[PDB]
């Protein structure tokens, strides 16, 4: 029997990037590479975050949504497409050097 569920307005991305860099100036090094040689599980990458209420699931699905629209996603897609086009036939025979 509520009027409006208060959607939490989220802090703007530029400030976010600023405290993220301020956090990056705080991390450690040796156990960082100790973390860095261990192939983690896409499971613990998003496991212990927040409130476990259909939301780690939703956030995982949303980050999956947003990843395929990134510059690396279409970059690898077009790299594969270009290689497959070169291997398909003589499509780009010789245009310039």
């Amino acid at each position: 029997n509520s009027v409006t569920v208060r959607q939490d307005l989220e802090r703007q991305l530029g400030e976010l990037r600023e405290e993220f860099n301020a956090l990056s100036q705080e991390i450690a090094m040796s156990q960082l590479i100790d973390l860095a040689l261990l192939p983690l599980d896409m499971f613990s990458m998003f496991s212990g975050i927040k409130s476990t209420i259909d939301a780690a699931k939703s956030m995982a699905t949303n980050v999956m949504k947003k990843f395929k629209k990134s510059g690396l996603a279409n970059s690898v897609s077009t790299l594969t497409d270009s290689l497959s086009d070169a291997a398909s036939s003589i499509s780009r025979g010789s245009s310039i050097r």
Binding site: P39, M42, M45, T61, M64, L72, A73
Partner: protein, 49 residues
């Protein structure tokens, strides 16, 4: 490390768009919602005249 991480976070675009269609068609197929008043009767003085 991130080889399998950034591998999998990209390979399962099929999972994510299948999840999109799954949740959409599920929303289409949602059923009715009913509440029970609870263990409490409701009455009064009916024949007002």
């Amino acid at each position: 490390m991130a080889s399998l991480i950034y591998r999998q976070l990209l390979t399962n675009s099929y999972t994510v768009d299948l999840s999109d269609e799954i949740q959409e068609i599920g929303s289409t197929k949602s059923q009715n919602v009913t509440i029970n008043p609870g263990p409490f009767a409701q009455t009064g003085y009916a024949p007002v005249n």
